Design a protein around this ligand. Structure first.
Ligand SMILES: [Ca+2]
Length: 44
């Protein structure tokens, strides 16, 4: 599809896509730490 990421993915600030369940999980999956920010943790 023309969308950036799939329906089950989290969109990193860099534009990289990662599985949504990978947010606030202890690993910097995005590489830019956007999936591990305090903000995303409070959304869990
Ligand atoms: Ca992570």
């Amino acid at each position: 599809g023309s969308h950036s990421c799939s329906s089950t993915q989290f969109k990193c600030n860099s534009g990289r896509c990662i599985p949504e369940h990978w947010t606030c999980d202890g690993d910097n999956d995005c590489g830019d730490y956007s999936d591990e920010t305090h903000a995303n943790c409070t959304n869990q």
